[PDB]
Design a protein around this ligand. Sequence first.
Ligand SMILES: Nc1nc2c(ncn2[C@@H]2O[C@H](COP(=O)(O)OP(=O)(O)OP(=O)(O)O)[C@@H](O)[C@H]2O)c(=O)[nH]1
Ligand SMILES: Nc1nc2c(ncn2[C@@H]2O[C@H](COP(=O)(O)OP(=O)(O)O)[C@@H](O)[C@H]2O)c(=O)[nH]1
Ligand SMILES: [Mg+2]
Lengths: 440, 430
Amino acid sequence: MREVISIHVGQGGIQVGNACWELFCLEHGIQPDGQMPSDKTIGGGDDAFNTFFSETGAGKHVPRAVFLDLEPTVIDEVRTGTYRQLFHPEQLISGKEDAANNFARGHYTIGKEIVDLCLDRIRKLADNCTGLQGFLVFNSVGGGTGSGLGSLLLERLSVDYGKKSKLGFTIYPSPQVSTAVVEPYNSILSTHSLLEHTDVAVMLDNEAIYDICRRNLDIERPTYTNLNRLIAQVISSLTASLRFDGALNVDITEFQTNLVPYPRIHFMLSSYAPIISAEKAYHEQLSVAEITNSAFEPANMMAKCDPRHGKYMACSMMYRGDVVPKDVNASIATIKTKRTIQFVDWCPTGFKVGINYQPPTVVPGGDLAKVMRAVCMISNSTAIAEVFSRLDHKFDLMYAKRAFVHWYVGEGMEEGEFSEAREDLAALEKDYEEVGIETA
Amino acid sequence: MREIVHIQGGQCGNQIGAKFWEVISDEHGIDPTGTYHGDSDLQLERINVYYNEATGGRYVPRAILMDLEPGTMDSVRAGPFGQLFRPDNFVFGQTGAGNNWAKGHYTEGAELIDSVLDVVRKEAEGCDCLQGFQITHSLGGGTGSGMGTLLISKVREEYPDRIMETFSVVPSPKVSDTVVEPYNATLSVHQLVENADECMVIDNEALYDICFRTLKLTTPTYGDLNHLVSAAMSGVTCCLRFPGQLNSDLRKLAVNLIPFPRLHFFMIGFAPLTSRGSQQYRALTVPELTQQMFDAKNMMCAADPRHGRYLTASALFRGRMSTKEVDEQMLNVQNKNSSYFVEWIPNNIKSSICDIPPKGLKMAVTFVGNSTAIQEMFKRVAEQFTAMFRRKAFLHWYTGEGMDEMEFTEAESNMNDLVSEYQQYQDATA
Ligand SMILES: Nc1nc2c(ncn2[C@@H]2O[C@H](COP(=O)(O)OP(=O)(O)OP(=O)(O)O)[C@@H](O)[C@H]2O)c(=O)[nH]1
Ligand SMILES: Nc1nc2c(ncn2[C@@H]2O[C@H](COP(=O)(O)OP(=O)(O)O)[C@@H](O)[C@H]2O)c(=O)[nH]1
Ligand SMILES: [Mg+2]
């Protein structure tokens, strides 16, 4: 019944998990205890929570989630949070010591012990669900746990599970404003595994989200919480169809059908158009035309790469709330008319459109205006080759110096994997450049 | 989970350790009797990382105090919180090295190493998941330096993968309390480079500088120096004891600051230090903390980094703050002084955040940067050792202990090679 097993790796992943799960509980009005309170007793509004939650049969709805980490700190802060009783304790897996940004350490030494318990919990949650769409996996491809454990988990999911899905939400190392020195190596190896084992990899860069926040929300001092809540809004809009009825319904499986044209090229930017201060929306009309135009402004991309340098290969717009199909068609027409926006020739029809009646909720405490119309665009564009070449350049610097390779080699990782992944990335950017050209 | 075994050896070692345990207790609100007195339950979520539990809820520091001058036992017992440590951990000789490295590394240290090895082994096996040991000592003295490097070699042979971090107090030609400081420092670092995971150097003259310029203290005593180094040391492992937004344990700092295994020397610093006079003037905010903790004066080493170039650097911020602010400050200082940072490293700064500040404080940073200026601070000791070794002064003191001149030759050559390595990776370009 449209079930979606969620996965979360690493500290970033688990913080995003907290965010998205607070958001979901607020959406379905599930009190922190886990008991959905009946409202007006006019009929049980079932079929809604079931996408993400699962009823234990006694009025307790537990989330179909699994949290994975090798450091017991953040997972315990989850345990000592407003949602302590909310999660079935088995799913909040933890390890004694962490990989410490050492992708290899988490990939061979530490992970290969907790991956078994995680796979067990996953098979459990799957045996529960009937008609599962696929798995969402949020992870920081910069950190050791995130990257490494995510690679291992995705490989195990690929081999053990059928064509269901694998949606990946990666917090890529921001191009300009980095946080760790070893980010290049972990990011590159994570990518080399990801491109093989993931269906869809929507990219996310904290730098771009910082810029979006200060530009629109005017929160000059954002924290990771605001970023988390923005990403939560995003993935909510991504699965709104699986829960709320609308004019057109886009199941998660349809992205991997539409957006990704070739098995290797499956990286995608994302954008969320109406993002306005509660006190600023007083001045905005928020027409669907305005939404659609703003969603294509390269500034509002959730990742940081300008598609004006690239080409839009495919786009998926998903609208929520007071949406009318006539205006949506008009807006996509006008956008196709624009010159700043260019589509590849061989893809003439570059749009998957979804329209869901459910207006996006507002979370108390997050600075976002109530709004009746929203969109989220997942776009596979050629400009992501820019960020990939950027990481290639940084990684090439470090590795031509052979800077930190000893750390990884100490973890039984054969150093040949480095050059192998770098050559794979060279081939990938070559693929992007190739498909960027028109036909002969 | 991720336990720590503190190891202090030597007079300066014992003073540093005593002040350190005082500060860590003030951080956990533990009263010198041994019980808890705080108010935030968080203060107990990670309390096992440094203390073991004893019967009656009394928490006992997982410390191991060792020395060769038995008077230091009386010394540590004298100060407050001297009641904390369990006397079983106390290990002491009777003779004392007397500033002699060999005496504390061959003749006498070899006779206490067995006992302290038993003690550290018991403390380790008692703990389940050991992050590693945080040893602290001074290289100027004999017992500290010699016994410290001996036991460090031993424990490294016994626990290779665990972190073996060391706060070493290298003597400076500025203060030059003793005269055999060159031989001690040389014969210490020669093994330090071979066994230590990561090393923070601390120079008394640098601490005096900080206590005279940054702080304006009419009478800086060794107590105040120990206080500063304690504040630093606590700030190092802060993320291990408190949740924060982006965690960073010791191993994370290690991997993020060690390009090559022989370059494991950093220069620490503490951000919000301000004199009681200028305290009300300079407002407390993240850019101020950056400007300070990156001042060439504010470093706890005597090496001016301006001459050098930061290979990598890290910072740990205590207290709730905006991740965008700190990360933007990092990027800013990166793009501001690009000459001061190696080019082949894309982003040489590692940032971390814990949202629990030091008591009575709002925000505070603990900077740890691997530079090449340290190569200068080692050139100092190298030329000092060369001078006082050409004519073979005081050499008989060491040779009578079973040590031979070949040891001095190999030690000074190893230090020279380390210096050349740092020099190359400074001048190297990409
Ligand atoms: N968007 C977002 N990213 C985060 C957040 N917290 C951490 N990150 C990302 O996580 C990276 C830090 O590494 P970690 O997430 O700690 O790596 P890990 O998988 O959690 O485990 P370790 O590698 O052992 O640290 C940084 O690059 C951040 O970009 C968060 O709250 N929100
Ligand atoms: N920073 C600092 N240095 C100290 C302190 N006490 C002693 N020292 C230094 O330690 C050196 C002497 O150490 P010593 O007593 O011989 O240690 P030992 O080798 O274990 O006996 C001197 O150069 C002092 O400068 C202190 O409280 N703080
Ligand atoms: Mg992490």
